[PDB]
Every structure is written in C-alpha cells, then in structure tokens.
Design a protein around this ligand. Structure first.
Ligand code: MG
Ligand code: MG
Ligand code: ZN
Ligand code: ZN
Lengths: 387, 424
DNA sequence: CAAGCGCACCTAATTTCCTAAATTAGAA
DNA sequence: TTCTAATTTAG
RNA sequence: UCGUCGGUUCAGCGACGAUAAGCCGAGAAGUGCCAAUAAAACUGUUAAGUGGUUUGGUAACGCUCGGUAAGGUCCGAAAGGAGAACCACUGAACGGAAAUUAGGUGCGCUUG
C-alpha cells in the first residue's frame, strides 16, 4: 500500500546549491526543535512532570496533544510550512504515545532525534511534473509566507531528480494516476553528501491469481539442497540444506561409537527424512503460490553430485506433487539433459561454483542457472533440438 | 594505586537462603536498577529543559539549590526514585543513580546538538555494590564467604533477611592470589557489580580493586614497534638490535566465518522449519542462534589477551621502555591486513594497560607511508613495488619482508615528524 | 540479485567510570 | 551507652 | 557434527545429551484482518476539499511472556528424585561494565 522510493536530487532549478543548501539546514534546525519541544509538551500533557515544575514557577485550553504543541511551536518555528509543521509534530507525539507505557514504567529513557533529521512533507506540498525534453521536476513547498519574503525564495523550490530504473516505472504511474503520493521526506546522507527525496506512494496491490503460463522450476543443486527460479522475474528462492549436513554427521559419529541401539538410530533417520521432506515440499509450493505460478517443472526421480546425496528422492516428488495439486498447480517431470551445462542468457547450449558462459559471459550461481534453465517452458525439447 | 582491575567470582550457593528465593531477589533488584537508571536519566533531561526555558525567560540560569532543593540533579533524583525503588540498598541506589546522571552530564553538549541520543538502559543491567557493602571472610577450612548488603530496611522486613546476604564464592587460580591480597590489604576493593551470564546461568561477583603496579627498571630510549601486518597478525622490530618477533595468526577469522555462516544458515532455515519454531515471538524464532551468543567476542577477547601478553613480554625481555604503534583512527588499509574484521582496538587497548603494569610507555604515531619508507636509506618511494611480501627499495637494494620494514620504521623515535619532512 | 520501508539482532570504535563525609536508626 | 549498618547529600 | 558438567574465556580430555537448525502452554502491548467512530492540522467567503483519529473484536505473526536433554556418587526395580549433600582433569590466558556512534545481517511487504 504505502511504499517509499528514493530519488536523489540533482540540482536546484532556480537557486544555487549553496543558497538551497543553507535553507535546508535552517529548516532542519526548526524541525529538530519542533520534534524535541513536542516531546517536552507531550511529557507535560500526560501529567508526568515533577512537582517543582508548577510549584516554584514555570485545562491548558486545547483538546489534543498535537493541538497544544502545534500552537506553542508555531511561533518559533515560523520558517517551516504550516502543513509540514503539523506532520513533524505528529511524528513526535505519536512516538511518545507509542512508548508511553515504557516511559512511565522505566524501561526507556526518552525518545531522541538525530541532528541530520529528515524534512517532512505532505501530499499537497509535493508535485512531480515531467518536462517535454525528458526531465523530471519535483516542485516542493517548504517555506511559509513570512519565510519566503525574508529569504527571497518566492514560488516553490523546484529540484531535478534522477529517475532511471525502477523509479521511472513507479514515477510514470504517479503522473498518470495509477499511483498517488501520500507523504514525503527530504533525507540527507553524510557518507555520500547527497540529498534524497523519499516519495511515499499509495496504490492497489496486484492480485496474484494462479496462471498456467508462469513456470517455476526446481534445481536439485550440488551445494544447495534445492533452488527455485522463474523466467518472468529475477526472483529466486533457495532451500539450503545446512541442517541436513549436520544431521548426517551426527548419525555417522553416533553409529561409529554405537559399536536395539542401531534399530532406534535407523528409526530416527526415517522420521528426519520424512519431516524434512514435508518442510521442503511446503516451502516450494508456498513460494509458487506467492509468485502466482501454476506450473512446477523439475527433474524425474545413485547419490549423484546433488546436495542431498542419499535421500528419499522419490518420496519428495510424491509430496511436492500432492502439495502443489492441492492448490491448483500442476507438475511436469522434465529430464535434466544438459540444463545445468547450458546458458540461460544467450542460449549457449554448449567449476560448478559459478557458471560463466563462454560466449555471452553471463556469470551467476550454477544452481541458479540450472533453475532458470529448467524454468523455460518445454526446455526438454529445445535442448534436444540443439543436441 | 593508580590502576583498577576486576576479577569475577562465581556464586555457588546462598547461605541461609534457597536458590529460588535468592534468584527472585536478584531479578527484583535487577529491575529496580533499570528503573532507577532510566528514571534518573529522565530527570536530568527534564531539568535541562527547565534550565533552557528559564535562561530565555529570566536572563541567567536557575540554581538547583533554590528550585530542586539540592546542589545537584543526583540528589533530587535520589529523592524521587527512593519511594519506588525501595528494595535496593540506599548506598547501592545512590551509586546506580550517580552513573545515570554523570553519563548525562558528561555528554550534555552532544545530547543538545543531536549528535548523541539520550541513554536508555537494558533489562539485564548489573547490580551495583559499594566498597562498604562488600565483605569477604574465609573460614579456616578453606571456603570463602562474601557478605553482601543488597536490601533495604523495608525489604529486610518483607523477605525476612535479618542481616546481610552471605553467598559462597569460588576462589581458585589467579583469583586466589587476588583475593588473598584483598583480605590482607595490598588491594583495596572499589565499587563492584553483580553480573549474570545467560549461557551458563551463573552469577559472578565482579570485584574491582586497586593495585600498585610493579616498576621495572627500563631505559626510555629503547623502542619496540608494532605493525599489524598483512601476512602476519603483528610484527615487532627494534632499531638497536636486528631481532624480530612475529605473531603468526594461525586462527583469526576462521572462527568468525564459521560462526556467521551458521548464524545465517540457522536464520535462513527458519523460513522452512518445524511447526514449534513459529508462533512464539521473536526470541523462540531466533532461538537457535542463541548458542552463538558471544563465541566470536570471547574468542577475539582471549586471542587478543594472548597477543598483548606476548608483545609486552618481548618488550620487557629486550629491556624496551617505549612501545610505538600505529594510530589506526585514520582507517588505513583495512581488510587487506592479516586480521580482516578483528578488533584492532581491543588489541591496542590491551597493550596499553598491560604495558603500564610493566612501566612501559605507549606512543601512537600517525601512519603515513610507514610501510613504504625503506628503513635503512630513508627514501619514501611513492610506489614501492610489490603490494605485499618482499619489499625492495631503489636507493639501497635493501630486501626484507614488508612487515619487518613496517616495524623497523615505527620503532624509530619521532618518525612521525621525520616522514612529513620527506614529502613537503 | 537489487532497492525502498518496518522491526530486531550482531560487531567495531570510542568515551566514562570503577564517591566519600556526615547523620541516623536499630541492636546489643 | 556503643556502635555498626543504612540513609542522605555536597563537591 | 553441535551442545552439558568439571571456578572464567579459548583449546584438549573424561562422562553424558541430541531429529535441539527439535517439542510445547497461557495471553493480549504492536503489526495484520474485521466491525463501529471521525479528532488535530491545512487550503478555502461559506459550502466543500485534503488528512486519518478513537473504541471493540480476532489470534496469523521476527507477536508478548514462559517451559522442555545433557558428569560421577546416592535413594528410587525402573521412570524419576530437592539449583538437597559430597566428588570432578591438562595447557595458554585472565580489566571489565554501561552507553553511544557507525557498519552489517536476518525476517516481513512492495517493486524491478
Ligand atoms: Mg570447555
Ligand atoms: Mg582450568
Ligand atoms: Zn550465454
Ligand atoms: Zn631503500
């Protein structure tokens, strides 16, 4: 629903980077003053003040803590926009109400705010418009009428933001109407000395319904117990078998030093293999329902180079199929052929740590490549056509 | 005198109490310590807010004696927390509060400027014990008993503990040398703490004490230099003698990589795990890595303890009086050193306090071209040759390991001034 | 694999601290 | 009546 | 292979536990979901517009708080038994506690 994305600020559109930078640092002092004062006033509002406060010298007229704080801090913080001051004060007082019980009990001292504090912004005070020559501009309303006059920054402060990549996909929907702005912030990073514009956006999450056209493959890996990949998204999931290696070392050592006892150790092995299969099968199907795939392609089932070595391989299929087919997903058993020794990037049919295509040069994890290769619709034939 | 050190003693059995009553007390007082620490920090921040509003509205700062009724924020904090943390000893509560307010007073400028957040104190806070509230007496038979004053007058009439709480402590090994000196008078017990170790479910009596260091006769013109190398954990060289002493690593990050790999492997396994591992909060889901609590920290602590002792012993064995090392605050050539994620500050901090017990002065110098300057000719080639291993300069043909010429350089007195006057 | 957000959990670097004097209440 | 442990507060 | 005990850390050794990267119970502070309700603030002649507050329920949560194995000896046929009593090795080291800053990691949602 409410997600954020950073857009680094290139340069001020009408100001210099010195005059613009100075204004931001003054608005940062007023933001931090408002955040700390709103905590003091929320500290008094809850009746937490000590006796000496209103005894030697120092109901209130308003209804909420935000109302009492906003009017008190309004006088001094006269540079921030009146809208943005409400959002800054709301953050401080909502954090005090969140931590109220720990503050009273004594499990926490007091909420604190860092020096390089973000500058809040409301929906109506941020607007992104695209210029015809492929430029992205974000007009920001940051100053109040008294501050605009003194600072000679009349109109809004426009900044150019680098929008390239996933941002251009999100941003181009904000301008159309699919995504709508909710709030915003102007963050500062001291390790790059760059200003950012976090534009939170509100949307309707996509409803993922099972599709018989999206395919999720499974790779019985060598260093990973299982690997999952998709050809419609770079998303990947891996069923690592760190617990399986430890159990096999445990049993072997106990078998050596065990020389009924052997009968009980064999019974434990059968249970572990079955339960691990249940956990492994459920994860595979759950990571398929999440991605909206309705087809699970995999191999058909000695020890092999596969990570599981000796294992109830046939039992795992009869639990992958049963769990997948309880949710509408079908299973296609595709022979391995040369899926591992093939390039998913340029279709180069042609150690095992990283696979590097000799022509295309794509280098990625071998188990991941063997999973994308399996994931291709009807990979079995297209390899057979080349071989 | 002049040095303070601690030694833990394990508490085996509480005399005249069960382990289910003493454990209940020790955790009740572990919550009043957290309350006192956290509430006394609120009063320091509150009083600071009052002062800022007073100066703007009245010209000059207010006086605590006239508004709070006390000459310090510590006294007012004691007056307000005394009614709620009524189980702690008054002495112990006073020291606990003093730590909270002194921390605030030390970093008050940073707190106002936003550079430092207001301190917040955790659940498993150690329990404070003053010098006057700790007494160790050993019976003839050979069993040490520590008498502790942990309770207040209302508490001693609610828990039915008429006198101090006596606990049996194990005193063996180097703890026997320290304790027998405390019972004599060579060492004076300072304010101490009670700590809980979660891995073994054991309570330790961390006793801090004061001891006069031994003063060996060591010339101050003898300097040993230490270089944290790339193929060796640390290298030591001297200017006067062509003697080298090297601390080859052996096992340094083998431990760290084999602990993080399990920690990530355990957490990643939680996504597909047994039914009982989910649905019981954060602790029961991250529970498998609770066996890896401080294995890395303890391994790096003991390993650095051995290295510092070896380094200081070589300085004493060769008669060295000054130990010059690098000031790595500038963050120079990290990762490529033999130690990669090691605690280079724990090694340096340990050498300092283990050299002052030996009467050895420690001087940190600014590492600038230290590993690039040939130690015989004195010609700082901006580009030496090889990245590591053998280093051959071109004014003299001097050949040696890059870690021995980086330890024969730090060993030169006032080399920090010399190097600058070779580039300006 | 990458990037935003929310949370918590680790580890390194770094600083500060590791009270006393006087008064009172309870016990022999 | 002495005194040893606990409380209180200045610096 | 990972842990428990042998005064602390590290390693070894002796005995023991291990499917422990496992099993289980209550509950309602937070997220999520559901049903009621609509404050502050802003822009506006008003009207209206933006914004989302407050209460209850539910129990899916890296939701909260917890429980669960591990030296010898002894009683107990055996389970089991009081954190009951007693006994328990070799080498190196043995200055810590709290907080803060910074970096990283994992989990969950969205997107490429
Ligand atoms: Mg051990
Ligand atoms: Mg030992
Ligand atoms: Zn290719
Ligand atoms: Zn040279």
């Amino acid at each position: 629903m409410i997600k954020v994305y950073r857009y680094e600020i290139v340069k001020p559109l009408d100001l210099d980077w010195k005059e613009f930078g100075t204004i931001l640092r003054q608005l940062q002092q007023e933001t931090r003053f408002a955040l700390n004062k709103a905590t003091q006033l929320a500290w008094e509002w809850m009746g937490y003040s000590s006796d000496y406060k209103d005894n030697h010298g120092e109901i209130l007229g308003y209804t909420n803590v935000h109302g009492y704080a906003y009017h008190t801090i309004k006088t001094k913080a006269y540079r921030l926009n009146s809208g943005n001051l409400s959002q800054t004060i709301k953050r401080a007082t909502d954090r005090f109400k969140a931590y109220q019980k720990e503050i009273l009990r004594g499990d926490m001292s007091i909420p604190s705010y860092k020096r390089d504090i973000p500058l809040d912004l409301i929906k109506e005070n941020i607007s992104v418009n695209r210029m015809n020559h492929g430029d992205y501009i974000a007009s920001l309303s940051l100053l109040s009428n008294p501050a605009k006059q003194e600072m000679n920054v009349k109109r809004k402060i426009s900044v150019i933001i680098i929008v390239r990549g996933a941002g251009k996909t999100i941003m181009d929907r904000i301008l159309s109407g699919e995504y709508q702005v909710h709030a915003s912030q102007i963050i500062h990073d001291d390790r790059k000395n760059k200003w950012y514009l976090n534009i939170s956006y509100d949307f309707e999450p996509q409803t993922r319904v099972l599709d018989l056209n999206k395919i999720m493959g499974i790779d019985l890996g060598v260093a990973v117990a299982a690997y999952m990949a998709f050809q419609h998204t770079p998303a990947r999931y891996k069923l690592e078998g760190g617990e399986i290696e430890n159990f096999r070392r445990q049993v072997e050592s106990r078998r050596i030093s065990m020389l009924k006892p052997i009968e009980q150790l064999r019974d434990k092995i059968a249970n572990f293999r079955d339960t691990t299969n249940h956990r492994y099968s459920r994860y595979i199907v759950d990571m398929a329902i999440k991605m909206g795939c309705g087809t699970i392609q995999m191999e058909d089932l000695d020890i092999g180079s596969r990570f599981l070595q000796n294992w109830t391989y046939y039992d795992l299929q009869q639990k992958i199929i049963y769990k997948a087919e309880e949710a509408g997903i079908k299973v296609i058993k595709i022979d391995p052929q040369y899926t591992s020794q093939r390039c998913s990037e340029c279709g180069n049919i042609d150690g095992q740590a990283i696979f590097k295509c000799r022509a295309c040069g794509y280098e990625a994890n071998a188990d991941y490549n063997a999973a994308r290769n399996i994931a291709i619709p009807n990979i079995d034939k297209i390899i057979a056509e080349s071989i």
